[PDB]
RNA sequence: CCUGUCAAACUCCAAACUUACAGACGCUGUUUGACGCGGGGAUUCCGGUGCGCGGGGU
RNA sequence: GAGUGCAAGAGCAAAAGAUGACUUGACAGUGUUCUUCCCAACGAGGAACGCUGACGCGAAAGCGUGGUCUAGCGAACCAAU
RNA sequence: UUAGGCGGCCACAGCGGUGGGGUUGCCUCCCGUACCCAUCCCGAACACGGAAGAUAAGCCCACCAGCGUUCCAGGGAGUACUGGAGUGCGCGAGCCUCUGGGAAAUCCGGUUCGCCGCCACC
């Protein structure tokens, strides 16, 4: 890369397909998950806050409690365990 | 400069004029020749020159071949003969030359070329059954000025 | 049920391909194994398709090879009808061969090594640089084709 | 509409019935919503909760079914609103609902409005709802006093049908008194 | 069917686009109600760089205030066919615009469940000329 | 309307393929203790070639 | 397609833009987590998300840990505060 | 749901068009400013109060495919491209065979003029 900021090379992954453009439905921004639940991580281009580092899009972690309204999701980056703070707006239940 | 330097497709497509400046003008004078006010459907015979190998043809070659071909059609059918010929490809690919050794080698802009895949029609002429052998002769002279071997193919025409 | 025989060595073969052969219990050239035809196994053989010879053998051929090259999980002991009878859920090789072909059991379940260590092909094989359709010996074979090979590696 | 790339709003946005930005902020409380809505003739109060396939109304009250308890007056006014809220509130208590947040949809937060009257009604039914007393109309108006004094400038009965000439905020008292009563068939 | 289709005057907007006022006073007396300042957008060479700043004034008349104005306003102009809008409006003159529409226009001006007025229910130049002409004056 | 062409820094489309998690089969581990944890000792931080995909350069 | 301070790419329409009004959360204290440094150790810096305290606005849910997001930054010793 | 309220999915729901529907019922348009409240000017809107009138708007019900969209069959196409393999071909750029996958444009015929959830209600 020519720069090393958090959004380097995120053109595609952080952009909405034209039709999915505009404010997102509130339903999923308010969803509730339980400790132990498997959740897919994917940032919603339309939702500014509660995001995680782009490098983590595509992960499927495990909810292990929460901080404020955001959730604490456990994942494994390569071989290292990490805890990610993320709001429901960017989460989806697995299966 | 020899074509050996640019005939192959061994580089990314380089055509974005919003990021490239100082591109030389094209030497191709015309893309539509003969009687361009008439239609191609108004003719019984349609012959095309087909490229047999994928290549890049510099605008200098297009003009030389287009010239030697249409120039023949003029001499044999008149400055207004009943025919029409088309060069369908346009030189979109920008060419460089590194003219300090290999340091900061990115070349300066020196020209343009058209990328043609094998089996494509470079030229397509439309004429009457009489002038069929004249268009075939124009093409023979045309393919002697572009890198690849070609096929002169008769599309619409069966009076043999 | 297909018969898998490694015909090309490990040197230079992709590691994920070599690991697949090892999961199929083959660790040497000319080693054969019997594999059920499932979606899971189908993918594995497809991945090893270029370094192996495989196909469904005939009852007789399987019987010849089982008699000649089958082995206990441990030890030299010959695997003949008597052995089969005193150690397996079958009365003789044929009963075993049939159950294998019909995929009702496996060499392991019956106390046998999952691998049949064959001998080089008498008269040589068709070459390991081309598939069957091109005259070589690699890839899926005809039941008669597999039989010819297995019998030659008797 | 125009092409592949065209962006059509969410249905309830086209229909201009749901303010999604307000809705989100509303749903953040985690409490049920006290949906206050108005019609030219009636007033509705619903206790809605979030659901997997859409909202869930656990209790509601419509100014129409207000008569079922002895209402012989119009149904598009302050006394009407307050009472409808109280009714819905009481029904809410029965369902086990203890708290809610006021959702006024596309109506304006005008002081003394009916949506706030609805709110005051629900609060009196025993529902815990975040509110602000000085944005609520003063008692008398809720009673319908503003309407009685209006009919004082008679010369022509305010009401077409005959509910009464000078109207009665006293009727309001009777109905409320009737609802706060334990018995009452909800 | 006709009662809820016959035109009406929603508003009469009287305004004077000056360019820098003391004119509010006249509009106030000729109309009957307070005037409104008019700001501008985009800077202009004609010493009109100040974005937000007085430049004109207008008055929107509704109901009687409008009719009682038009009664003495219309007689001052010579209405023409071209002087009419496509929605069924016309502006003459100090400018004086008259906004005409049918009974259920509120449907497109209210907050809740607003909706745009269907073309069929939209007023027409012809339908407008008629209505107006049908009230103290002549067309073209 | 018709007719002739394009894009590493275009996309109404769109693979093969790569990848997170889970189950299943396989293989493997429970005396050959895997996975993991803690500690001692390093060497190493001039690499090269083939193939596939490249970017620069005749 | 406007606008949103400035590269580029991205976000945004009953708004994240415009107007008007009010206001000083550009607040004090202390954390969790990610980033910096994929995997995989490493500081300053940065961000997201909390709690405690005190406040602003709003009917209220709620929003405000500066500017819609990714640049705008600096150890020890010493001095001043 | 003989017209309602809150929604989920967020164009299969858009754009455009045709037909039908309302005596004390519903939604509206509608009528009207003493009040709560309101317009940097207007009871236009917002807010409040109310039924003389109407089904013309909206809305709800039935329907049309011309445009946009979703999905399906056939054609394009097992083409373009491509993961694995080759002492296969080509001066070479490159191509081919075997194995495992597999488009896009476009043509043609269908589909689509929303579906579903909760509450209330001749
Ligand atoms: Cl993160
Ligand atoms: Cl409402
Ligand atoms: Mg990219
Ligand atoms: Mg052994
Ligand atoms: Mg020999
Ligand atoms: Mg050989
Ligand atoms: Mg120093
Ligand atoms: Mg100092
Ligand atoms: Mg009608
Ligand atoms: Mg060779
Ligand atoms: Na969105
Ligand atoms: Na130099
Ligand atoms: Na840090
Ligand atoms: Na002003
Ligand atoms: Na109607
Ligand atoms: Sr190259
Ligand atoms: Sr040649
Ligand atoms: Sr990749
Ligand atoms: Sr921010
Ligand atoms: Sr009015
Ligand atoms: Sr050569
Ligand atoms: Sr297939």
What domain count does chain D have?
Answer: 1
Rounded distance between C-alpha atoms, residue D12 and residue D18, angstroms: 5
Number of Cβ atoms within 10 Å of the Cβ of D13: 14
**Ligand closest to CA E106:** 20
Q: Which residues of A touch D6 (CB under 8 A)?
A: 19
β-strands C52-55, C2-6 pairing: antiparallel
Listing DSSP states for C81-105 in one string gives: HHHHHHHSSSSSHHHHHHHHHTTS-
The two structure tokens encoding residue B111: 């020209």
Q: Report the CATH number of the A1-95 domain.
A: 2.30.30.70
**Structural domain containing residue B136:** 1-160
Rounded distance between C-alpha atoms, residue C99 and residue C93, angstroms: 10
What domain count does chain B have?
Answer: 1
Phi-psi label, residue E56: left if phi above 0, alpha if psi -120 to 50, beta otherwise? beta
**Which DSSP symbol is given to A19?**
G
Rounded distance between C-alpha atoms, residue C5 and residue D99, angstroms: 73
β-strands A70-77, A80-86 pairing: antiparallel
CA of C121 to the centre of ligand 6 (A): 12
CA of A11 to the centre of ligand 3 (A): 7
Let me know if E82 is exposed, middle or buried by CB neighbors in 10 A (0-12, 13-18, 19+): exposed
Rounded to a whole number of angstroms, the distance from the CA of D94 to the nearest CA of chain A is: 26
Let me know if E90 is exposed, middle or buried by CB neighbors in 10 A (0-12, 13-18, 19+): buried
Instruction: Write out which nucleotides of chain G lie closer than 7 A to a protein Cβ.
Output: 9-16, 19-20, 31-41, 48-51, 58-65, 68-71
**Structural domain containing residue D49:** 1-186
Q: Å between A69 CA and G31 C1'?
A: 16
**Contact flag A19-D5 (C-beta cutoff 8 Å):** yes
Angle at D18 between CA D61 and CA A40, to 5 degrees: 110
Distance of CA E52 to the CA centre of its chain: 24
Edge-to-edge order in the sheet of strand D33-38? D56-62, D43-49, D33-38, D101-103
What CATH code is carried by the domain that includes residue D99? 3.30.420.100
**Closest among C42, C47, C44 to C13, alpha carbons compared:** C47
| H or E stretch at C15 | helix C15-23
Sequence-ordered alpha helix ranges (H) in chain E: 24-31, 64-73, 125-133
Query: What are the CA-CA distances from residue D156 to residues C116, D73, D164, D165 (Å)?
Result: 111, 17, 12, 9
What CATH code is carried by the domain that includes residue B31? 3.90.1170.10
**Which DSSP symbol is given to C29?**
T
Q: Which residues of C107-117 are buried (b: 16+ CB within 10 A; e: fewer)?
A: beebebbbbbe
| H or E stretch at D91 | helix D78-94
Q: Å between B118 CA and H80 C1'?
A: 14
**Contact flag A18-D21 (C-beta cutoff 8 Å):** no
CA of B141 to the centre of ligand 17 (A): 10
Q: Which residues of A touch D7 (CB under 8 A)?
A: 18-19, 21-22
Those residues whose C-beta lies under 8 Å from the C-beta of residue E112, and which sit 6 or more positions away, are D16, D17, D105, D106, D107
| H or E stretch at E95 | strand E95-101
Cα-Cα end-to-end distance for chain E:
29
Ramachandran angles phi, psi of C43, nearest 5° = -65, -45
Query: What are the CA-CA distances from residue D46 to residues D19, D119, D136 (Å)?
Result: 17, 11, 19
**Contact flag A30-D24 (C-beta cutoff 8 Å):** yes
Q: Which residues of D touch A69 (CB under 8 A)?
A: 28
Q: In chain C, what are the domains?
A: 1-57+114-154 (3.30.1390.20), 58-113 (1.10.15.30)
**C11 CB-to-strand F distance under 7 Å:** no
β-strands C139-140, C52-55 pairing: parallel
- The 3-class secondary structure across B85-154, one letter per residue, is EEECCCCCEEEEECCCCCCCCCCEEEEEEEEECCCCEEEEEEECCCCHHHHHHHHHHHCCCCCCCEEEEE
Phi-psi label, residue B104: left if phi above 0, alpha if psi -120 to 50, beta otherwise? left
3-class secondary-structure state, position A75: strand
Asked whether D66 and D80 are in contact (CB, 8 A), the reply is yes
Query: Does domain E1-140 bear CATH number 3.30.413.10?
Result: no
- Percent helix, strand and coil across chain D, each to the nearest 5: 40, 15, 45
Q: Å between D160 CA and H24 C1'?
A: 12
Which chains are adjacent to chain D, needing at least 3 Cβ pairs under 8 Å? A, E
User: How many residues in chain E?
Assistant: 140
The two structure tokens encoding residue E60: 């929107």
Domain boundaries, chain A: 1-95
Which chains are adjacent to chain C, needing at least 3 Cβ pairs under 8 Å? none
**Which DSSP symbol is given to D128?**
B
**B13 CB-to-strand F distance under 7 Å:** yes
**A76 CB-to-strand G distance under 7 Å:** no
Ramachandran angles phi, psi of E136, nearest 5° = 65, 65
**Bridge partners, A91 (sequence order):** A41
Strand F contacts (CB < 7 A) among A residues 5-44? 17-19, 38, 40
The most distant pair of C-alpha atoms in chain E lies apart, rounded to whole Å, by 55
Rounded distance between C-alpha atoms, residue B142 and residue B33, angstroms: 14
User: How many residues in chain B?
Assistant: 160
Among chain E residues, the shortest Cα distance to D106 is held by E112
The two structure tokens encoding residue A6: 């958090």
């Amino acid at each position: 890369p020519s720069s090393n900021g958090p959004l380097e090379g995120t053109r595609g992954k952080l952009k909405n397909k034209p039709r999915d453009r505009g404010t997102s439905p509130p339903q999923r921004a308010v969803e509730e998950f339980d400790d132990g639940e498997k959740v897919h991580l994917k940032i919603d281009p339309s939702v500014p806050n509660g995001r995680f580092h782009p490098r983590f899009d595509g992960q499927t972690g495990t909810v292990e409690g929460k901080q404020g309204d955001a959730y604490k999701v456990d994942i494994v980056d390569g071989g290292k365990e990490k805890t990610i703070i993320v709001t429901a707006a960017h989460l989806r239940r697995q299966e | 400069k020899p074509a050996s330097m640019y005939r192959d497709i061994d580089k990314p497509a380089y055509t974005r004029r919003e990021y490239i400046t100082g591109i030389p003008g094209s030497k191709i004078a015309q893309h539509k020749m003969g009687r361009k006010q008439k239609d191609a459907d108004d003719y019984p015979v349609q012959i095309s020159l087909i490229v047999e190998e994928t290549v890049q043809l510099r605008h200098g070659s297009l003009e030389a071949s287009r010239l030697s071909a249409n120039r023949h059609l003029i001499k044999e059918l008149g400055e207004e003969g009943d025919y029409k010929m088309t060069l369908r490809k346009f030189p979109h690919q920008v060419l460089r030359e590194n003219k300090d050794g290999m340091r900061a080698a990115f070349g300066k802009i020196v020209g343009t070329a058209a990328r043609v895949q094998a089996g494509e029609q470079l030229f397509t002429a439309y004429c009457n059954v009489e002038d069929a052998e004249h268009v075939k002769e124009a093409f023979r002279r045309a393919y002697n000025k572009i890198t690849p071997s070609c096929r002169i193919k008769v599309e619409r025409g069966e009076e043999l | 049920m297909h018969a898998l025989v490694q015909l090309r060595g490990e040197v230079n073969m992709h590691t994920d391909i070599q690991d697949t052969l090892e999961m199929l219990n083959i660790h040497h050239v000319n080693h054969c194994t019997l594999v059920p035809e499932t979606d899971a196994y189908r993918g594995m053989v497809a991945k090893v398709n270029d370094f192996v010879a495989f196909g469904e053998p005939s009852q007789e051929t399987l019987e010849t090879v089982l008699a000649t090259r089958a082995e206990p999980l441990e030890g030299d002991a010959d695997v003949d009808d008597e052995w089969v009878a005193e150690h397996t859920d079958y009365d003789d090789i044929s009963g075993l061969a049939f159950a294998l072909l019909s995929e009702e059991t496996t060499l392991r379940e019956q106390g046998l090594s999952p691998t049949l260590r064959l001998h080089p092909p008498r008269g040589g094989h068709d070459g390991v640089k081309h598939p069957v359709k091109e005259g070589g010996q690699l890839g899926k074979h005809d039941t008669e084709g597999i039989d010819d090979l297995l019998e030659a590696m008797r | 509409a125009t092409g592949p790339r065209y962006k059509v709003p969410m249905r309830r946005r086209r229909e201009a019935r749901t303010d999604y930005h307000q809705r989100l902020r509303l749903l953040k409380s985690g409490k049920p919503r006290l949906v206050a809505r108005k019609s030219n003739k009636h007033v509705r109060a619903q206790l809605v909760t979030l659901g997997p396939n859409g909202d869930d109304t656990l209790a509601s009250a419509h100014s129409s079914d207000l008569a079922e308890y002895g209402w012989e007056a119009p149904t598009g006014n302050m006394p009407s609103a307050y009472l409808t809220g109280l009714l819905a509130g009481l029904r809410a208590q029965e369902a086990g609902v203890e708290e809610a947040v006021l959702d006024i949809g596309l109506n304006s937060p005008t002081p003394g409005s009916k949506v706030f009257a609805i709110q005051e009604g629900a609060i009196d039914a025993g529902l815990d709802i975040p509110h602000n007393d000085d944005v609520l109309a003063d008692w008398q108006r809720t009673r319908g006093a503003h309407i009685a004094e209006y009919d004082e400038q008679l010369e022509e009965p305010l009401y077409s049908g005959d509910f009464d000439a000078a109207d009665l905020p006293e009727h309001f008292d009777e109905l409320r008194e009737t609802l706060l009563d334990g018995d009452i068939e909800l | 069917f006709h009662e809820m289709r016959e035109p009406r005057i929603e508003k009469v907007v009287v305004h004077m686009g000056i360019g820098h006022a003391n004119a509010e006073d006249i509009l106030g007396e000729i109309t009957g109600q307070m005037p409104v300042r008019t700001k501008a957008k985009r800077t202009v060479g004609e010493f009109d760089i100040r974005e937000g700043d007085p430049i004109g004034a207008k008055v929107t008349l509704r109901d009687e205030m409008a009719e009682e104005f038009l009664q003495t306003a219309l007689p001052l102009a010579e209405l023409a066919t071209s002087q009419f809008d496509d929605t069924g409006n016309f502006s003459f003159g100090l400018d004086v615009t008259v906004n005409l529409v049918r009974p259920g226009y509120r449907v497109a001006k209210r907050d809740k469940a607003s909706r745009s007025i269907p073309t069929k229910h939209r007023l027409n130049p012809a339908d407008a000329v008629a209505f107006i002409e049908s009230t103290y004056d002549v067309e073209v």
